[PDB]
Design a protein around this nucleic acid. Structure first.
Ligand code: MG
Ligand code: MG
Ligand code: MG
Ligand code: MG
Ligand code: MG
Ligand code: MG
Ligand code: MG
Ligand code: MG
Ligand code: MG
Ligand code: MG
Ligand code: MG
Ligand code: MG
Ligand code: MG
Ligand code: MG
Ligand code: ZN
Lengths: 178, 135, 125, 133, 37, 137, 11
RNA sequence: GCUCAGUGAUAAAGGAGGUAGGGGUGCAGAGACAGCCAGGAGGUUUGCCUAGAAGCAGCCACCCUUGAAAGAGUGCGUAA
RNA sequence: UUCACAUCGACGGGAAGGUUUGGCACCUCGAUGUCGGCUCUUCGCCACCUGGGGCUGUAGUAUGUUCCAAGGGUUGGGCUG
């Protein structure tokens, strides 16, 4: 009941259509549709003032954790269909490049083969041939995911910082060979 | 390494360790102390190591009393020695401590340095212990 | 909790006429054997082992692998545990008819529903 | 922007100064003779000096406190400070020498009064082991 | 990763978490990474 | 933290520095160096008293001495000026010029109070133009 | 191992 | 009332924001914890040592001033 | 080099295992018998290689240490009871 997160209500802006059936929430905004199910304990109230205040059926430690989580989840799917989410990763190294063509993201990271990545519908990926990659999507989880899959292929190494990194990253740089 | 200088008989009864030591209970020399929680046998080697550790970690702190001492002999029969033909050879010396007994006393540091020091001291003991402050 | 009930009825322990040496019991038809529920982590923890009879011949499934592969075997294996062992035991075990779907081809036998007097037997999510 | 340490009325030796700030594009002779002229205006002493430079290679510098350690070393008439301050006392200075050193160091301090500067100098002499009364 | 029965914060930036039942130490620097076991 | 006794003595000291002063000057500061804090405190304590205080600390000290019409100046960070000795325009003038040097250094003038009357950010211009005791007398 | 087991009547 | 470990079959030192309780002690309504904005100064580059030691190799001292606060410096870093 | 915890880890402590050398004498005495090879298995994991990893005092190659992993592999000779 006393989580500083669950007390803060969510603001649904105009352009945002909220459909609620029982525990199932379907929201249709400017960018699309997002669907989630709530667990048993979480009761989210859609106000008359156009706000979302999260309440909980019982307080087990369980439900406490739950409600903090879901207030933030559904704030993220609201703000997600409204504006969207941008994850940006840049690549550092000699010959490191990326090309979006049709349904693939082609990475040349210094492997033998070019790496191909099939882009899901929900995502729109923009490439700067200046070695930057921005991925935009309505769902926080899916954009973050795919971004990490990008970063996985060649994680930033300690010495020269080479490889794929997020735009803001502290990379431990050891002095090799001294 | 602590040890008695003389006894008549060499070899001695294992004995039995029961109850609480009422007499060594108080902390009468220093400020902070390490108190024995459990009924055990301390070799002189262990006391040596504990004192050494506490002394080295305190260093710039002054004083360490050792409130115990290994006066009871202990005997062992060798390897591949069949049972019978006399009691064995005294190898080392133990001090018998019972719960409540004070082991180490310490003075000349802040409570923090004392806590750390006494912890490292307790690490070389066979027994569970406690940190106590003077009254 | 269900398998205990089932065992009672199959055995005949709920009739005034009960006899240990005879089959007085019923037939029991279990339907929807893939929706059976289990508490806690058992879905991933509980372990069904079976052994070839050669050395190194041990095999293990988690409850869930089993339930995706051949889910009837789960309830058969849980009830057979609670039936007597030995001749009457096995002959009894044939009286348990298990189906994974919601439909059984026994409509001709006119099945009654099973009485359940247990409180805890019905789980709610 | 770089900080250097130079002697009072002497400038432009090759090893200590010229190459160091001259690799930053600073004019050597202008900074040297202006530093020696501003040191000639004030009482001459060893000056730690912060020289600030700009993209157009012009430069402006602020002369910091001539070291209170050095000024109190010449005030006690000594050379080397105490190896163990507040244990071994290597000299003694009067309160008038306190007000004198705090007067020469007054434009270079943040002190709003003469008493604050005098107590600062007394703290520095107590720090290098020089007694003050 | 170090693995040992006794895991403690080895500096200020260290954090003891609980992951899938085992006690772990995550830090800023890699060397201070520990797992209980 | 600060005990209630130390805070009642602080509000009492601000109140005693308030009874003697004929004028108030409100100023807020965020993100500026201590060097110019100490230059401003080379200029200020000579002719004037400067005291930085909390919103409530100023509230309860001002209501009693009847400067209360100045309450809206207490919104946000609060630093105050009281004139114990020198005139009002000698204290008011350096602050506005120091704000014109503080344009990138993040200063704003909330308001001043004189004649028991509240004057906004712009209306203190007059309070800057007033001459010295030698010209008035 | 320095601990024994419980055999027979002990057990 | 408790446990979420299938613990409920066995073993220790040690570890631990596991969890449910109980007891002291700090603060706060002139706003306490966490976050966020800013400041973090002067002596002074403390003395010694050292080619250099400037808070931050080492040794000793560890005061004073301006102060809302700021250690002769907790860690990183520089040949310094 | 600085740095206890890359790697070592003294003085001491707490364990597991049941493969060494032992203690015991519960066991069989009538014909319940020890060490090597051959043939033939099989199992354990405290992992020598092969699969995947973390840390490094890992630039690279190669290591070091450790984590999961026992599916497979683990030569031919001179010498010995
Ligand atoms: Mg009793
Ligand atoms: Mg112990
Ligand atoms: Mg055993
Ligand atoms: Mg068990
Ligand atoms: Mg350790
Ligand atoms: Mg016999
Ligand atoms: Mg025979
Ligand atoms: Mg293993
Ligand atoms: Mg491998
Ligand atoms: Mg490896
Ligand atoms: Mg190498
Ligand atoms: Mg294998
Ligand atoms: Mg195998
Ligand atoms: Mg093998
Ligand atoms: Zn750490």
């Amino acid at each position: 009941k006393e989580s500083r997160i669950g007390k803060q209500p969510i603001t649904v802006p105009a352009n945002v259509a909220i459909a609620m059936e029982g525990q199932d929430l379907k929201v249709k905004g400017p960018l699309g549709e997002l669907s989630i199910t709530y667990p048993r304990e979480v009761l989210v109230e859609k106000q008359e003032s156009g706000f979302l205040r999260v309440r909980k059926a019982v307080e087990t430690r369980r439900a406490n954790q739950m409600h903090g989580l879901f207030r933030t989840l559904t704030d993220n799917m609201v703000v997600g269909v409204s504006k969207g989410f941008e994850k940006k990763l840049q690549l550092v190294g000699v010959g490191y490049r990326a090309t979006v063509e049709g349904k693939d993201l082609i990475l040349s990271l210094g492997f033998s083969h070019p790496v191909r990545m099939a882009i899901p519908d929900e995502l729109q990926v923009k490439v700067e041939e200046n070695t930057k990659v921005t991925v935009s999507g309505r769902d926080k989880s899916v954009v973050g995911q795919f971004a990490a899959t990008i970063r996985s292929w060649r994680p930033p190494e300690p010495y020269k910082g080479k490889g794929v990194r997020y735009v803001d990253e502290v990379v431990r740089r050891k002095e090799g060979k001294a | 390494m602590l040890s008695p200088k003389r006894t008549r008989f060499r070899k001695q009864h294992r004995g039995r360790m029961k109850g609480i030591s009422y007499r060594g209970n108080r902390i009468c020399f220093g400020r902070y102390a390490l108190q024995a929680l459990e009924p055990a046998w301390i070799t002189s080697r262990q006391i040596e190591a504990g004192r050494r550790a506490m002394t080295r970690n305190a260093r710039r702190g002054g004083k360490i009393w050792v409130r115990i001492f290994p006066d009871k002999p202990v005997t062992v029969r060798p390897a591949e020695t069949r049972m019978g033909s006399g009691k064995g050879s005294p190898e080392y010396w133990v001090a018998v401590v019972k719960p409540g007994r004070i082991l180490y006393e310490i003075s000349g540091v802040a409570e923090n340095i004392a806590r750390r020091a006494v912890a490292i001291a307790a690490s070389k003991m066979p027994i569970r212990t406690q940190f106590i402050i003077s009254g | 909790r269900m398998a205990s009930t089932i065992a009672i009825h199959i055995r005949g322990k709920n009739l005034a006429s009960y006899t240990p040496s005879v089959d007085m019991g019923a037939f029991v038809i279990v339907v929807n054997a893939d929706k059976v529920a289990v508490s806690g982590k058992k879905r991933t923890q509980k372990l069904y082992r079976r052994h070839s009879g050669r050395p190194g011949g041990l095999k293990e499934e988690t409850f869930d692998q089993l339930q995706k592969r051949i889910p009837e075997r789960i309830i058969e294996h849980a009830v057979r545990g609670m039936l007597p062992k030995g001749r009457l035991g096995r002959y009894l075990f044939n009286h348990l008819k298990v189906y994974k779907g919601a439909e059984h081809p026994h409509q001709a036998q006119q099945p009654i529903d099973l009485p359940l007097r247990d409180k805890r037997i019905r789980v709610e999510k | 922007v770089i900080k250097l340490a130079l002697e009072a009325g002497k400038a432009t030796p090759a090893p200590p100064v010229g190459p160091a700030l001259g690799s930053k594009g600073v004019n050597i002779m202008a900074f040297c003779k202006d530093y020696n002229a501003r040191t000639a205006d004030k009482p001459g002493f060893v000056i730690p000096v912060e020289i600030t430079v700009f993209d157009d290679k012009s430069f402006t510098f602020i002369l910091k406190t001539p070291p209170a350690s050095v000024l109190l070393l010449k005030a006690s008439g000594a050379e080397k400070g105490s190896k163990d301050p507040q244990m071994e006392k290597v000299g003694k200075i009067t309160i008038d020498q306190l007000r004198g050193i705090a007067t020469e160091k007054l434009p270079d301090l943040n002190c709003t009064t003469i008493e604050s500067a005098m107590r600062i100098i007394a703290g520095t002499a107590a720090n290098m082991g020089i007694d003050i009364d | 990763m170090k693995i040992r029965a006794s895991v403690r914060p080895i500096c200020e930036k260290c954090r003891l978490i609980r992951r899938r039942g085992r006690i772990i130490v995550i830090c800023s620097n890699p060397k201070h990474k520990q797992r209980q076991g | 933290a600060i005990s209630r006794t130390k805070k009642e003595e602080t509000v009492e000291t601000v109140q005693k520095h308030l009874e003697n002063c004929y004028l108030l000057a409100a100023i807020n500061y965020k993100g500026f160096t201590v060097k110019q804090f100490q230059d401003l405190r080379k200029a200020l304590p000579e002719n004037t008293t400067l005291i930085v205080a909390k919103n409530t600390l100023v509230e309860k000290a001002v209501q009693d001495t009847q400067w209360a019409a100045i309450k809206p100046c207490m919104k946000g960070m609060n630093a105050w000026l009281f004139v114990h000795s020198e005139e009002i325009p000698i204290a008011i003038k350096p602050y506005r010029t120091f704000q014109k040097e503080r344009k990138l250094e993040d200063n704003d003038f909330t308001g001043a109070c004189f004649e028991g009357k509240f004057y906004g950010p712009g209306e203190v211009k007059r309070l800057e133009t007033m001459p010295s005791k030698a010209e008035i007398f | 191992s320095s601990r024994p087991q419980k055999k027979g009547t002990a057990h």
